[PDB]
Amino acid sequence: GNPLVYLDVDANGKPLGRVVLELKADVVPKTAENFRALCTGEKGFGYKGSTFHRVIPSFMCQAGDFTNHNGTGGKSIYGSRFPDENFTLKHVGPGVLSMANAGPNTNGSQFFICTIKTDWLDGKHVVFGHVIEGMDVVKKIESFGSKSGRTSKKIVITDCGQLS
Ligand SMILES: Nc1ccc(CNC(=O)NCC(=O)N2CCCC2)cc1
Secondary structure, eight states: OOOEEEEEEEETTEEEEEEEEEEOTTTOHHHHHHHHHHHHTTTSOOSTTOBOOEEETTTEEEEOOTTTSSSSOOOOSSSSOBOOOOOOSOOOSTTEEEEOOSSTTOBSSOEEEESSOOGGGTTTSOEEEEEEEOHHHHHHHHHTOOTTSOOSSOEEEEEEEEOO
16 A cells, blocks of 8 residues: 655754654555655655754754755756655644645655645645654654754654565
8 A cells, every 4th residue: 555654863962762654655655656666765765864864843844955955956766856746735733744845846855734724825735645653753853853944953864764
């Protein structure tokens, strides 16, 4: 069925624990496949070692720029960017996993995990999964953000991969 993947996350070099994500390949197979492969690193690049570079309390935690390591970069397994697959899934609440972007059809590798319902992003960001386990870890990450998005600890995905 739908892939289960994980992110193991450090803050200032010490482990917070594991976030487990279900990828909704049934609804958004291309977007789910991209994220899955970036977790395993099987194409020779991916999320391992990359950061949560911008985190805003009571909103979301954003990550996945493994090319420029500053929020301007990332790439997909298909090429630098790929289209918005569909907007069928909605930003319904905490734990939603969705693609960051720079406008229409600019999905790469950057993603975010919501910590609240973010309805204004519906129709603009492709939702492609949800947290299965580890919301406690997500709340810790969230607690290290700020209004400007700047993090107060260095938040690193030390390991990631596929569970099923
Ligand atoms: N592929 C790609 C994706 C994102 C960017 C830079 N864009 C962003 O940080 N956009 C903000 C964004 O998507 N957000 C922030 C609310 C969580 C969703 C640049 C390239």
